[PDB]
Amino acid sequence: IRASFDKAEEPMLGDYPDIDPFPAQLKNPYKKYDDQQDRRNLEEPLSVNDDLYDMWSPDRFTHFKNQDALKYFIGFLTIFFGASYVATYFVPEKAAIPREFPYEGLWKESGGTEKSKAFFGQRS
């Protein structure tokens, strides 16, 4: 009833009681059930798509609405990457040159031959 896919399987059921789906975790823990673990009385009617509302289902957080939390998450991500990318413009530059190498940049040492010096070469 409550979810959109639970609404989607409405016309396929016939001779089936059409329960309101309620998550088995968001039930009270202190009401005594027949199984304390699954939080279920012994002959209680099961919803369609009951394994999405079982105890063994996802954890189903309570504190934020899900659209709120997607806004907050994509918020923090674009906060970090935006500050990351604007902070590349305000950098200072170096106090040394990048160091260079003998034997014409070790090209024979880095595999190489004389036709292949730009492919396997260093600063010289």
Binding site: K108, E109, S110, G111, G112, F120
Partner: protein, 90 residues
């Protein structure tokens, strides 16, 4: 005993005899395996080069590494079917 059966081709033979066709089949197959152990010999030689060389393996066995990576697309099992179903130069 290390017996060496004779080498037969797909081209001299009549295909209506089965003896010669089966031998040309097995010949082409075993020749691909000989090719393959040549490739494996160069691979073990190259890793011996790398382990003995240490830091200068770039220049001691540039040519062994180039040889292994040039042999690798061409030295494998290819199958007798592709040559026996089709004739080039025809």
């Amino acid at each position: 005993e290390h017996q060496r059966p004779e080498l037969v081709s797909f081209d001299d033979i009549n295909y209506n005899d089965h003896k010669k066709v089966r031998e040309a089949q097995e010949s082409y197959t075993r020749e691909q395996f000989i090719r393959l152990e040549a490739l494996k010999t160069v691979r073990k030689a190259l890793e011996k080069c790398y382990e003995e060389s240490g830091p200068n393996h770039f220049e001691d066995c540039k040519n062994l590494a180039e040889q292994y990576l040039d042999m690798l697309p061409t030295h494998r099992l290819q199958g007798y079917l592709g040559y026996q179903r089709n004739d080039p130069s025809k």
